[PDB]
Design a protein around this nucleic acid. Structure first.
Ligand SMILES: [Zn+2]
Ligand SMILES: [Zn+2]
Ligand SMILES: [Zn+2]
Ligand SMILES: [Zn+2]
Lengths: 585, 620, 187
RNA sequence: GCGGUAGUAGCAUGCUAGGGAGCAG
RNA sequence: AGCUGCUCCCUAGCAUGCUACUACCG
């Protein structure tokens, strides 16, 4: 009994075949219920026939006969069609505006989340429809994943090694760090707490959260939520006022904040200044230096997951007193610099899944590109701050959409903020990148990065390029091709001083296989933001649309500030990047 | 009966609800899971579950009515104004409630004095008033439960009295009904602690589906729910300056008691010509019919009536339990043997020995009757009939059998002795025989603790049926009260009816071609209802007028009295009604310019409209 | 009710009858154009009398579901009220005295009458007269129910603070005289 | 000339619902 | 601030029932 989604009018009718059960006014409901695959409408009572044994539940056919609603084959003479005038029968029949062009909502309703175009329309429409599309997308996500293979491991191989059995008739979903399960312990009646763990190459090896000893009888699933409706938009309306509103001018600053002063003012002088960030330019330092500039401000540490606020926790030990902060964690093993559940404290350390709804001055939204509109708009519901801070950039990598099937999402459509830096521009500019030497930062410039990144140090002269040979063979979800592994080990013998690296690969199963032959650790490309090594190892292994994507590989290119080896089965970036090439054994 | 005797030995902190700790999504509660009765022993619930997930509407309703969490979270209380057991104080201060005086309708009094009333030495004078009370009125009225004492019974005599009493209730039918078949008059009354913080009975009868009420009713057949009763003061006209209170029972009790008892209660109130006369009207010739039914064909008849001192606060618990069992005997096909026991336990835990909120504190009630529960006026009648039958048994068994001249009555006495103290099960033939004997020589007309009896005089002078002294003795040893013979009456001439019944006197008048019996009230009651009111709006006559029409209906039969100052009351009322109509109509012609037409409103100030209400050809 | 399919038909029947009345030719003029009119009788009877019943039934239905929506909202309101009350009285309760007596019980059950008697922190006494005051709580500490209590505050029937010096045998007739004593459990 | 039905108006009896008041236990 | 029973007044509605006027067919 509230406003409908497309008309802002009080109604009482809900699409029965939708997933959200949204409010739709009488003419607006007629439009949607004739123009799509939504065939049912519910009111204060469900518009269904009352003759025992009826299951035809369309919209037009039903007939109202007093204290009941019939079908034409169920109908005593005193009646009227429930569908007439192009207007379904329900409360507030008059004062509904309706809408003629509702094919956008119609497509969102019929959008089954397979094509890229689904995401394109879902990110091109207006606000509350943005919300409807987002929540339908996440609901369909959990319909997708939970109904797949049961993680019923029916024996233990060895220490951190298991034997696997899975659901029949329904296939089994990936076993990667992008896909985290959740444990339930069976007793003679029901289930008990186990927790979330990951599976990898074994014969199943599990990268467990913490120590556990499970015998037979146990099995796992990846649990989810029951996502409820939201409240607020993706962002607040902008400002162009005259004041640094709500805060206090400055006396002290450290001169390493020289590039910090110029952008402090713009974030607080107007509603929001949306931050774009190249890898390792000092953004978190800036996001910590915000409170350094004004000791009196409340700024709310957010992220995609806690592991990035743990980064803002790591540098919290560096700068600010521990008596003004609180690290909120839901009732998991993460970083905790402070005490939990102290909301009323100045510094708010949490993530989008943690903080209770309050009000604050500035919210430091971290790693935006790995967030979709839903988790982007939640804090807009929880926290009505006057100023926003969006640490992130669509330029790095988007959140894992398992329904990426046909096409690939461009950073124009990762979220609304993601095209916002591409429509109004980034209201952020930091040219001093402490990450990379004269090789990479100069190279990432012409890549996508606005020709704004350029050298800080000189050339370290070992960040070389080597384009490879390439042969293709896949098994389930990634590929193992020791051809791409062969030159790694065989050219490493030329440099024994090359044992300080990590072997990253787009095919996450390669690191689990390569470590048997190579010994350097593992790392997943898409969840590798923030972490860097001095010397790094990679093989692109192909130039399909998953890894070497010109905006999306660039997390692991700015990895090295000393030396790299970019093994290329590729043409995407070789003649595009700016390094030197050697011979292949 | 044995439990009543043995329970006076044990500490009084051991009776009442038994509580336990449960978890609702990891947060601990304290709830009732049983009961320790003084009469029924220890009772344990059958559906108890620790570690539940949520609470429905029904479980919230049950946990809110529990006294467990209200008393477990208040202060300790030591109230020295009473001898009753005090439990807890639910706030930080005590509340002292008063009662206000009445409002004076000066217009009616002036009109009545200009017609010759209230003269020196008149037979009609004012004796009904609104009496005021001060702050200590509620607790001093609650302290009258010190007259309830533990009473053990003659069990072999009671087990025979109950069979005869049951024979009195054979023409009716009862059983359980569903939630869509119960009927509520006036859904705009209070729901009773803690539920009067949020709405009236309409709120809870609307928020509950027909299937939630059925679930709650089915729940009370395996579990016990204790509730809380609130004590309220009344604001009414009276002839004595003592304060009056009523018990307000909570909604969780009424909702289920209606489903248990309403079929039988509505069967009783639709029967004519029986001993219990609840539901019979006195209008359109009904008073005459009742009087002729009670006269029956008794031989050398007299009339008699008696009273009960402190009836609702001196009733022993055993007779209250017995009344409940007699009322529940009609469930032989719908309810099992365990279901009926749990319904009895629920009744005892809610309206017999429950927790009472007087002021803002909780006390323990020893026993007696709660005035405002769902079965009051019918249990009172059962208690009445039980006491009368006991009086007759004691009259007949305490008579020297060697001097009885009739040979039928001697065998009756012999067999009555050996059906009390020698026979162990029920003998149906002798119960029928004794019932017939009583119905012929001892005829009763019963409302809820009022009575009139027509009896054989020659039998009573020889001690073969009950007299007024037998009632005195029975009340002394089975009720713990002394009944003074200055509040009883007797009448040896039948052509003037009962001296009193439901506050009415009787007159044999000539109506048309024959003679009929009419009821009339005390004139002071009607005049006092004229002069003193409980709202200031009722001190202007032209705003209602219907009040005076109704009060004139009540006063019509005084026109036939031999005392001339009694007919003047009816005539005064008619004159006043005419004056009020004229003064209301002569306002719309001056203050405004509205011409009202006398659309047959002249019938109200003529005697035919009122005479028609006492003549046998209905129009109800 | 004028835009019905038969308003035009009865209109044209009476219009032709008007045309013939301006004509006035034959006996069939009367018979016919009183029967062009006498056919357009059922139109404007059923089409204007069955349209007079469907609308009443529609209004009935709309009012009824208005009622049901309001009754459905008040239910949620009272649900929230009851929940808040229960969880509020929950937080004056979960002490360690309670768990201490509960764990000493052999099966988990205890009488309810001994919980305020053994776990409450505050006591309230109501005194009718001075003679009772002397025998119950004279001094500044007294013992009741196997414990020691310590007085804080005394008020009278008007909720006004009395001081312990005023309560005397010769000042007694100047006090509003139920007095209410508040004490705290001594440790 | 009558019957049947369909409309419209006025009148009574009964049932239900809502509101106002009076008495009794 | 309660549970019951009875009675008066006012409005709404439903069907029913009686009764009157018009039309159509037989
Ligand atoms: Zn709409
Ligand atoms: Zn729909
Ligand atoms: Zn149907
Ligand atoms: Zn039953």
């Amino acid at each position: 009994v509230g406003a409908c989604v497309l008309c802002n009018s009080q109604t009482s009718l809900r699409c029965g075949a939708c997933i959200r059960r949204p409010f739709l006014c009488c003419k607006c409901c007629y439009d949607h219920v004739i123009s799509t695959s939504h065939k049912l409408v519910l009111s204060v009572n469900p518009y269904v026939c009352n003759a025992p044994g009826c299951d035809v539940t369309d919209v037009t056919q039903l007939y109202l006969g007093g204290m009941s609603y019939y079908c034409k084959s169920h109908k005593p003479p005193i009646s009227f069609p429930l569908c007439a005038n192009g207007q379904v029968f329900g409360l507030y029949k008059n004062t509904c505006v309706g809408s003629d062009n509702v094919t956008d909502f119609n497509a969102i309703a019929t959008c089954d989340w397979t094509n890229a175009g689904d995401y394109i329309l879902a990110n091109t429409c207006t606000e509350r429809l943005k919300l409807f599309a987002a929540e339908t997308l996440k609901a369909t996500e959990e319909t997708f994943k939970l109904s797949y293979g049961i993680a019923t491991v029916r024996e233990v191989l060895s220490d951190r090694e298991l034997h696997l059995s899975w659901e029949v008739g329904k296939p089994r979903p990936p076993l990667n760090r992008n896909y985290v399960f959740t444990g339930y312990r069976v007793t003679k009646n029901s289930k008990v707490q186990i927790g979330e763990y990951t599976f990898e190459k074994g014969a199943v090896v599990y990268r467990g959260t913490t120590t556990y000893k499970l015998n037979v009888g146990d099995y796992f699933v990846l649990t989810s939520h029951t996502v409820m409706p939201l409240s607020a938009p993706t962002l607040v309306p902008q400002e162009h006022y005259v004041r640094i509103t709500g805060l206090y001018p400055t006396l002290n600053i450290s001169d390493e904040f020289s590039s910090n002063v110029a952008n402090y003012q713009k974030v607080g002088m107007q509603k929001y200044s949306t931050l774009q960030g190249p890898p390792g330019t000092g953004k978190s330092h800036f996001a910590i230096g915000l409170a350094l500039y004004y000791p009196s401000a409340r700024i709310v540490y957010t992220a995609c997951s806690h592991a990035a606020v743990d980064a803002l926790c790591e540098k919290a030990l560096k700068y600010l007193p521990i008596d003004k902060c609180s690290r909120i964690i839901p009732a998991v093993e993460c970083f905790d610099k402070f005490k939990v559940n102290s909301t009323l404290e100045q510094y708010v350390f949490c993530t989008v899944n943690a903080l209770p709804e309050t009000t604050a001055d500035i919210v430091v939204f971290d790693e935006i590109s790995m967030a979709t509109n839903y988790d982007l708009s939640v804090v807009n519901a929880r926290l009505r701050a006057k100023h926003y801070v969006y640490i992130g950039d669509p330029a790095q990598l988007p959140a894992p959409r398992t329904l990426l099937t046909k096409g690939t999402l461009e950073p124009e459509y990762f979220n609304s903020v993601c095209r916002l830096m591409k429509t109004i521009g980034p209201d952020m500019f930091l040219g001093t990148c402490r990450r990379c030497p004269a090789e990479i930062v100069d190279t990432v410039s012409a890549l996508v990065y606005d020709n704004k990144l350029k050298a800080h140090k000189d050339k370290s002269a070992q960040c070389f390029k080597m384009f490879y040979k390439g042969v293709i063979t896949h098994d389930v979800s990634s590929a193992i091709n020791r051809p791409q592994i062969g030159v790694v080990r065989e050219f490493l013998t030329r440099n024994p001083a090359w044992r300080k690296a990590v072997f990253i690969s787009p095919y996450n199963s390669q690191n689990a296989v390569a470590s048997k032959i190579l010994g350097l650790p593992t790392q997943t490309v898409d969840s590798s933001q923030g972490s860097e090594y001095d010397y790094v190892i990679f093989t692109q292994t192909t130039e399909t649309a998953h890894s070497c994507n010109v905006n999306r590989f660039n997390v692991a290119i700015t990895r090295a500030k000393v030396g790299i080896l970019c093994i290329m089965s590729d043409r995407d970036l070789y003649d595009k990047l700016q390094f030197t090439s050697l011979e292949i054994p | 009966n044995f439990n009543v005797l043995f329970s006076t030995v044990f500490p009084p902190t051991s009776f009442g609800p038994l509580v336990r700790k449960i978890f609702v999504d990891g947060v601990p509660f304290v709830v009732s899971t049983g009961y320790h009765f003084r009469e029924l022993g220890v009772v344990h619930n059958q559906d108890v579950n620790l570690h539940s997930s949520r609470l429905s509407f029904k479980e919230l309703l049950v946990y809110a009515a529990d006294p467990a969490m209200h008393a477990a979270s208040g202060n300790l209380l030591l109230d020295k104004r009473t001898t009753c057991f005090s439990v807890a104080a639910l706030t930080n201060n005590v509340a002292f409630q008063t009662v206000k005086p009445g409002n004076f309708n000066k217009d009616f009094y002036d009109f009545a004095v200009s017609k010759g009333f209230f003269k020196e030495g008149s037979s009609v004078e004012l004796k009904h008033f609104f009496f005021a009370q001060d702050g200590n009125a509620a607790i001093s009225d609650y302290d009258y439960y010190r007259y309830n004492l533990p009473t053990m019974c003659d069990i072999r005599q009671l087990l025979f009295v109950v069979e005869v009493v049951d024979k009195y209730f054979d023409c009716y039918d009862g059983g359980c009904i569903n939630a869509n078949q119960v009927i509520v008059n006036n859904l705009d009354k209070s729901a009773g602690f803690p539920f009067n913080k949020w709405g009236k009975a309409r709120l809870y009868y609307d928020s509950m589906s027909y299937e939630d009420q059925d679930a709650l009713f089915a729940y009370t057949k395996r579990n016990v729910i204790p509730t809380i009763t609130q004590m309220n003061l009344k604001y009414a006209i009276s002839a004595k300056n003592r304060a009056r209170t009523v018990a307000g029972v909570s909604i969780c009790s009424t909702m289920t008691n209606r489903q248990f008892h309403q079929k039988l209660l509505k069967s009783i109130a639709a029967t004519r010509g029986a001993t219990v006369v609840i539901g019979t009207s006195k209008f359109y010739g009904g008073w005459h019919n009742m009087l002729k039914t009670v006269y029956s064909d008794v031989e050398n008849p007299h009339l008699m009536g008696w009273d009960y001192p402190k009836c609702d606060r001196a009733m022993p618990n055993m007779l209250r339990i017995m009344a409940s069992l007699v009322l529940a005997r009609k469930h032989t096909t719908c309810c099992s043997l365990s279901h009926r026991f749990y319904r009895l336990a629920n009744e005892c835990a809610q309206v017999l020995s429950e927790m009472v909120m007087c002021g803002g504190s909780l006390y323990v009630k020893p026993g007696g009757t709660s005035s405002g529960d769902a079965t009051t006026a019918y249990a009172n009648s059962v208690f009445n009939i039980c006491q009368a039958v006991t009086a007759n048994v004691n009259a007949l068994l305490s008579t020297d059998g060697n001097k009885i001249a009739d040979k039928y009555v001697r065998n009756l006495q012999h067999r009555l002795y050996e059906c009390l103290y020698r026979n162990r099960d029920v003998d149906t033939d002798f119960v029928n025989e004794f019932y017939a004997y009583l119905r012929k020589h001892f005829s009763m007309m019963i409302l809820s603790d009022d009575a009139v009896v027509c009896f054989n005089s020659t039998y009573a002078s020889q001690g073969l049926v009950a007299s007024i002294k037998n009632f005195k003795s029975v009340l002394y040893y089975q009720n713990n009260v002394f009944m003074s013979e200055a509040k009883c009456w007797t009448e040896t001439d039948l052509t003037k009816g009962p001296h009193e019944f439901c506050s009415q006197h009787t007159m044999l008048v000539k109506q048309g071609d024959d003679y009929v019996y009419l009821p009339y009230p005390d004139p002071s009651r009607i005049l006092g209802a004229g002069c003193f009111v409980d709202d200031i709006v009722k001190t202007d006559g032209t705003l209602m007028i219907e009040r005076f029409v109704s009060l004139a209906i009540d006063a019509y039969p005084l026109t036939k009295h031999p005392n001339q100052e009694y007919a003047d009351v009816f005539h005064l009322y008619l004159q006043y009604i005419r004056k009020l109509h004229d003064e209301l109509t002569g306002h719309m012609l001056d203050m405004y310019s509205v011409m009202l037409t006398n659309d047959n409103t002249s019938r109200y100030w003529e005697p035919e409209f009122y005479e028609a209400m006492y003549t046998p050809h209905t129009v109800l | 009710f004028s835009s019905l399919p038969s308003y035009a038909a009865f209109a044209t029947a009476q219009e032709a009858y008007e045309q013939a009345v301006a004509n006035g030719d034959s006996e069939v003029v009367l018979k016919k154009l009183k029967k062009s009119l006498n056919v357009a009788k059922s139109e404007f009877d059923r089409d204007a009398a069955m349209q007079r019943k469907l609308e009443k039934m529609a209004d009935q239905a709309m009012t009824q579901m208005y009622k049901q929506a309001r009754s459905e909202d008040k239910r949620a309101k009272v649900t929230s009220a009851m929940q808040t009350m229960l969880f509020t009285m929950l937080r004056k309760l979960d002490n360690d005295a309670l768990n201490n007596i509960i764990n000493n019980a052999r099966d988990g059950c205890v009488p309810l009458n001994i919980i305020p008697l053994t776990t409450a922190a505050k006591l309230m006494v109501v005194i009718p007269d001075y003679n009772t005051y002397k025998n119950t709580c004279d001094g500044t500490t007294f013992t009741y129910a196997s414990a020691l209590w310590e007085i804080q505050q005394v008020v009278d029937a008007d909720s006004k603070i009395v001081q312990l010096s005023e309560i005397s045998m010769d000042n007694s007739p100047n006090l509003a005289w139920p007095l209410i004593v508040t004490a705290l459990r001594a440790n």
